[PDB]
Structure formats: C-alpha cells, structure tokens
C-alpha cells in the first residue's frame, strides 16, 4: 500500500495569481485627433464660407 | 402610446456653433517677397542705365 498525490485531497491547495489579468485600455482614435464640440441638442448647425 | 422625438416638434430647440467658420486671410505674395515703395502721387520716374 502507499500515500497517492489523490490520497492527500485538499491538503494539497492550489493556488491562484493576477500575474496574467490585465489589458491596457484603447480610446478612440478620432476623439483623440480632433477637436470634441460641445452639444446641447440633438441638431448643431455650423455655418461655413462657400464663395 | 408614447412621445416621439417628432411627437415633441420646436419644444426641441436646435443648436448652432461658429467653430467652423474662420479662415485665416492669405496676402498679396507680391507685397512680401518685393520692396514696398511708399508713393506720394500717381507717377514716379526711375531712370536706369540704358547703353
């Protein structure tokens, strides 16, 4: 007869690490590129020269 | 049996911005890459070397 790794059960623990657990975040690109504009309402109108 | 946004119709203000409406002016390139000769009246007579 012997002692198995299976006839020891939980005083045998198994342990845990956050080693692997994290990812940087990426933002959007064209919030970062350009200019974010202000809204009050659904509909901004901008005018802009034409001629 | 509910309110639309176009159920609602001007109670919904739109908005404006002139964010977009600038522009910066371009100069005369004549005016910067030449000499500005400050004239007095109409005409001015330059003689030159000729022969």
């Known amino acids: 007869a ?3 790794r299976a ?3 939980t005083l ?3 342990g845990y690490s956050h ?3 994290a990812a940087a975040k990426q933002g959007s690109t ?3 590129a350009f200019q974010n504009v202000n ?3 659904k509909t901004t109108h901008l ?3 034409a001629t």
Do not use: K, N
């Open 2 to 4: 012997d002692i198995s």
């Open 19 to 21: 080693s692997l657990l």
């Open 12 to 14: 045998i623990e198994e």
């Open 7 to 9: 006839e020891v059960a």
């Open 30 to 32: 064209v919030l970062s």
């Open 47 to 49: 005018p802009v020269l």
């Open 39 to 41: 809204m009050g309402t």
